[PDB]
C-alpha cells in the first residue's frame, strides 16, 4: 500500500467451529452472512427466519444482546469469543457461514 493508509488490521481469533454458539447468536451470525453474501439469499434466509422466530431473537420489544453479538463478526463457543471480521481472505468467511448453516440445521 503506502497510499492513503488502509484501515488497520482487525484483532481477534477467527474460527469456523460452532459447537456451543447457542441460538440467537447463530441467528445474528446468519444475519451478518445473509447480507454481505458469503452464503446466499435462498439457503441462508430460511435459517435466519426460523432461528430468530423459534428462539425469539428480535421479538420487537425484547433485547437478546446475543443477536447484536453476531450481527457483527463475534460469536461465543465453549467460553471463547471468535471474530468473523478476521479471515481476511474472504474465502474463509465463506465455509464459515456455511459451517454456521450446518450447525443451525439441527437447531431448527
Amino acid at each position: 500500500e503506502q497510499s492513503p493508509p488502509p484501515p488497520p488490521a482487525v484483532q481477534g481469533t477467527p474460527g469456523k467451529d460452532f459447537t456451543g454458539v447457542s441460538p440467537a447468536n447463530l441467528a445474528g451470525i446468519m444475519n451478518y452472512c445473509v447480507e454481505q453474501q458469503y452464503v446466499s439469499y435462498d439457503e441462508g434466509n430460511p435459517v435466519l427466519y426460523g432461528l430468530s422466530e423459534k428462539y425469539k431473537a428480535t421479538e420487537q420489544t425484547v433485547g437478546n444482546f446475543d443477536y447484536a453479538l453476531g450481527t457483527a463478526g463475534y460469536f461465543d463457543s465453549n467460553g471463547k469469543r471468535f471474530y468473523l471480521v478476521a479471515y481476511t481472505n474472504e474465502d474463509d468467511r465463506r465455509a464459515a457461514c456455511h459451517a454456521a448453516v450446518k450447525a443451525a440445521q439441527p437447531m431448527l
Binding site: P4, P6, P7, E35, V85
Partner: protein, 723 residues
C-alpha cells in the same frame, strides 16, 4: 449561455475565475477559488463592503450564486433575491408563497440551501416541494413543477420538503427532497432545464411490494435492493427513508451523478426491517448515469443504519496519488464520523478512517470497508440505552467543507453532540405531524432540576459537546491542524488561492484564517450567528467575500438551553460582503431576544409526567428541549397562550398561527393531551422565571456566560482514541 456546463467544467481548470455558477462553485464541489487578490499578508485589512437585510427571521443556510456581477441568493421560506454583487442593491426579488400549513412537515427550519444557474435562468426548490425556474435578468417565472408524484407508493406518511440546492447536468435539473425524520420514500428527479418536463426519476429504496414504479431505478431495486429489506416491517408503511436532501454531484470527468442517500425511516432498525438485512441504498453513495438515470455503482457507508448516520453530506472529487499513481477519487465526510476515500469511476473502496471520535465502530473492515460494529452500538438489537458519539446531528452536517490544492488539504467543520438512543416503549407508533424515529423521547433531553442523575448527565453532556475545524490530509489520512471553537453548529468553509480560509462562527463572528497553519488573521462581528458557507467572487475586477448570516437550523430549534454555549446570539438575518476597501458598517440591532414574562401560578401536577412526554414528541423539535427555546422560535414559557385552556387549544389544536408556521396538532393529539402540555409548560415557566430574570439582570441585558454554559478554558479537539 456560453453553453453553461462548459463554463462550470472550465471553472475547475482556472476558467471563469470570478464567478460562482454552481453550488460548490464547480462540478467537483471543491469550493476553491483561484482569486489571490486577498491573501494572508493582506486579509487582515479586510473591511465590510455592503450588506442587505433579509425579510425573514429564521436560519439562512443558502449558498449564493454569482453570475458576471449579479448575486442570486435564496433565503428562508424559499425566497430568492437577485442583488448587485458589487454594491448590494436589490435588482429583483421573487417569493413562491410557500403555504404555511406544511411548515411542520419539514425536519429542521424552512431553509433553502442554494440554487442553480443555466442558460440565463435560475432554478430553485421551494419548501413545499416545487421546482421553479426564473429568468436570470428580469426575474419572471419561466416554469414551475411539483416534484412529488401523486402516484407511486412513497409510503403512507408522505412528509416531503425541498431545501437542498439543485444541480444541473447536461441540461437536466436534478433535485431530491427530505422528510425521512417523519417518514418518506427517498428519490431524486431530473427535469428538463428548458421546458420543465420530467426527464427521469431514481428511487433510493424499493417499493413495499417489489413492484415496478416506472422509474429508472426499477431493475436495481427489484433485483438487488429489495432482498436486503427485511421481510415485513415498518418500512412498508413509513416509506423506508433514504432521502437525498444535501448532496447531488455531477462528475463530467467520469460522466456520473453521485447521490448521497440519507438515513432510514424509522431510525429504529428492528422496527423498520425486523433487525434484518442491509437495507440497500440507505446511508450510501449511489452513482448513476446522468442521461438515463440508470444505476452504475454504489457503496454503503453505514449498513443497518440506526443512529441517523446519513451519507448525504458533501461529496467532493479530487485527484490523488493512490498507490504511487494519480487517480480520480471521491472524498466524503458523512455524519458517522469517518472520512472515506473511494474510487470515483468504479466505486471501489480505497480507505476510510475516523476524522473525529466515534464509539459505534472499531474502524472499518480493510477488505470491504464495512464498519466493525461494537455489539453495544446496535442499541436497537440489544434493547439497551446507548450513548452514541456522534449523535443524530453527526460529526459533519450540511455545513460545507473546502479543499485547497496549494496545501492539498480538506477543511471540514466538525462537531461533537452525543445522543442517548433507546427504543420507543410499547413498540413502534407512528404519529401524524410528529417525528417517527421509533426511539424513546423521554430519554433524550436534559433537565435543570437538582436530581444527581440529571446533574451528572448534564455535566457530562456539556463536557463532551464541542466544535472545531479540521484540516484533513487525505494522503496521510491524518489531521494537519485544527481550529478550536466554543461550540458546534458553525458555518461552512471557503478556500481561496491566497492561502486563506473563511468561515462564519456560531457566536456571530466571520473569521479568516491562514490555510497552512490555521492562524487567525481576520475577525468581524456580524451581530448574528453564521451557519451558511462563505463564497468569494469578482465584480468590476475586484474581489468580494460574501456570506449570509442568520441563527437557525435543527440545533437551536432542538437543543434549546445548551444551544448558546458558543456565545449569546439571536437571529438578525442578512447578507454581508467584504472587500479590500469596503466602507460600510452594520447598524445597531436589539439583541435581547425573547425576554421572560411572568406566568400564571396555577398548574396541575398529575398531568406533569405525560405532559412532558407529549412535549418531547410534538413540540420539542421546534421550541427546544425541556420547553427552553434556542433563540429563533418563541419561548413557550413566556407565551400568553398557556395562560388559559381555550387559547392554548385554539393555538395548538386549531393552528391559529398557521400563516407563520404553527400548524394544527388536533390530527394527532386529543384535547386532554394538549392540556397536559399546557400544564407542563406552565410548571416549567413557574420553575424557571426567577432564574431567567436573575440571569438577564446585568449591564448588557442578556444572560451571562455561566447561565449560557459557555465553556471557560479551551477544550481539547476530540480526534480518535478519545472524545
Amino acid at each position: 449561455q456560453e453553453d453553461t456546463g462548459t463554463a462550470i467544467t472550465s471553472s475547475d481548470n482556472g476558467g471563469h475565475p470570478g464567478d460562482w455558477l454552481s453550488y460548490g462553485r464547480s462540478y467537483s464541489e471543491q469550493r476553491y477559488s483561484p482569486l489571490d487578490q486577498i491573501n494572508t499578508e493582506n486579509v487582515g485589512k479586510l473591511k465590510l463592503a455592503w450588506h442587505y437585510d433579509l425579510d425573514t427571521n429564521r436560519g439562512q443556510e443558502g449558498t449564493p450564486l454569482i453570475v458576471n456581477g449579479v448575486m442570486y441568493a435564496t433565503t428562508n421560506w424559499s425566497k430568492m433575491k437577485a442583488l448587485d454583487a458589487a454594491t448590494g442593491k436589490l435588482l429583483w426579488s421573487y417569493d413562491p408563497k410557500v403555504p404555511g400549513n406544511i411548515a411542520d412537515r419539514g425536519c429542521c427550519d424552512t431553509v433553502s440551501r442554494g440554487a442553480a444557474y443555466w442558460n440565463g435562468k435560475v432554478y430553485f426548490g421551494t419548501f413545499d416541494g416545487r421546482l421553479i425556474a426564473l429568468d436570470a435578468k428580469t426575474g419572471k417565472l419561466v416554469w414551475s413543477v411539483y416534484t412529488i408524484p401523486k402516484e407511486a407508493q412513497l409510503g403512507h406518511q408522505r412528509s416531503y420538503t425541498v431545501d437542498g440546492a439543485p444541480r444541473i447536468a447536461k441540461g437536466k435539473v436534478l433535485i431530491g427532497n427530505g422528510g425521512a425524520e417523519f417518514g418518506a420514500r427517498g428519490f431524486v428527479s431530473a427535469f428538463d432545464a428548458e421546458t420543465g418536463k420530467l426527464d427521469w426519476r431514481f428511487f433510493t429504496v424499493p417499493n413495499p411490494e417489489n413492484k415496478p414504479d416506472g422509474a429508472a431505478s426499477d431493475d436495481i431495486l427489484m433485483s438487488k435492493a429489495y432482498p436486503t429489506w427485511g421481510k415485513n416491517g415498518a418500512w412498508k408503511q413509513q416509506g423506508g427513508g433514504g432521502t437525498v436532501w444535501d448532496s447531488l454531484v455531477y462528475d463530467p470527468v467520469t460522466d456520473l451523478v453521485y447521490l448521497g442517500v440519507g438515513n432510514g425511516s424509522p431510525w429504529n432498525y428492528k422496527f423498520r426491517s425486523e433487525g434484518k438485512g442491509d437495507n440497500l441504498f440507505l446511508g450510501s453513495i449511489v452513482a448513476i448515469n446522468p442521461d438515463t438515470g440508470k444505476y452504475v455503482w454504489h457503496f454503503q457507508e453505514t449498513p443497518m443504519d440506526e443512529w441517523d448516520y446519513t451519507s448525504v453530506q458533501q461529496i467532493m472529487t479530487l485527484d490523488m496519488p493512490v498507490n504511487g499513481e494519480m487517480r480520480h477519487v471521491i472524498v466524503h465526510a458523512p455524519k458517522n464520523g469517518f472520512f472515506y476515500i473511494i474510487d470515483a469511476k468504479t466505486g471501489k473502496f480505497i480507505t476510510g478512517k475516523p476524522y473525529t471520535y466515534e464509539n459505534w465502530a472499531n474502524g472499518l473492515d480493510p477488505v470491504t470497508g464495512r464498519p466493525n460494529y461494537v455489539p453495544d452500538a446496535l442499541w436497537t438489537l440489544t434493547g439497551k440505552p446507548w450513548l452514541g458519539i456522534p449523535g443524530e446531528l453527526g460529526g459533519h452536517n450540511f455545513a460545507a467543507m473546502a479543499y485547497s490544492p496549494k496545501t492539498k488539504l480538506v477543511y471540514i467543520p466538525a462537531q461533537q453532540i452525543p445522543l442517548l438512543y433507546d427504543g420507543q416503549k410499547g413498540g413502534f407508533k407512528a404519529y401524524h405531524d410528529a417525528w417517527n424515529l421509533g426511539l424513546d423521547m423521554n430519554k433524550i433531553g436534559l433537565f435543570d432540576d437538582n436530581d444527581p442523575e440529571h446533574v451528572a448527565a448534564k455535566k457530562d453532556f456539556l463536557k463532551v459537546l464541542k466544535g472545531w475545524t479540521v484540516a484533513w490530509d487525505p494522503e496521510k489520512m491524518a489531521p494537519a491542524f485544527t481550529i478550536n471553537h466554543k461550540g458546534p453548529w458553525n458555518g461552512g468553509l471557503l478556500a481561496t488561492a491566497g492561502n486563506v480560509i473563511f468561515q462564519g462562527l456560531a457566536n456571530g463572528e466571520f473569521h479568516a484564517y491562514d490555510a497552512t497553519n490555521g492562524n487567525d488573521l481576520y475577525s468581524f462581528p456580524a451581530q448574528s450567528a453564521i451557519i451558511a458557507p462563505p463564497v468569494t467572487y469578482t465584480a468590476n475586477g475586484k474581489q468580494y467575500v460574501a456570506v449570509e448570516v442568520g441563527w437557525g437550523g435543527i440545533y437551536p430549534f432542538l437543543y434549546g438551553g445548551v444551544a448558546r454555549t458558543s456565545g449569546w446570539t439571536v437571529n438578525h438575518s442578512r447578507v454581508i460582503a467584504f472587500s479590500l476597501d469596503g466602507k460600510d458598517s452594520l447598524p445597531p440591532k436589539n439583541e435581547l431576544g425573547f425576554t421572560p414574562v411572568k406566568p400564571v401560578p396555577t398548574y396541575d401536577e398529575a398531568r406533569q409526567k405525560d405532559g412532558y412526554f407529549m412535549y418531547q414528541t410534538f413540540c420539542s423539535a421546534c421550541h427546544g428541549d425541556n420547553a427552553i427555546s434556542g433563540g429563533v422560535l418563541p419561548d413557550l414559557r413566556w407565551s400568553g397562550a398557556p395562560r388559559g385552556r381555550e387559547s392554548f387549544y385554539k393555538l395548538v389544536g386549531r393552528g391559529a398561527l398557521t400563516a407563520y408556521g404553527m400548524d394544527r396538532f388536533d390530527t394527532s393529539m386529543t384535547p386532554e393531551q394538549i392540556e397536559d402540555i399546557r400544564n407542563f409548560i406552565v410548571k416549567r415557566a413557574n420553575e424557571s422565571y426567577d432564574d431567567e430574570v436573575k440571569a438577564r439582570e446585568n449591564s448588557t441585558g442578556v444572560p451571562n456566560d455561566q447561565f449560557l454554559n459557555v465553556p471557560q478554558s479551551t477544550a481539547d479537539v476530540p480526534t480518535a482514541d478519545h472524545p
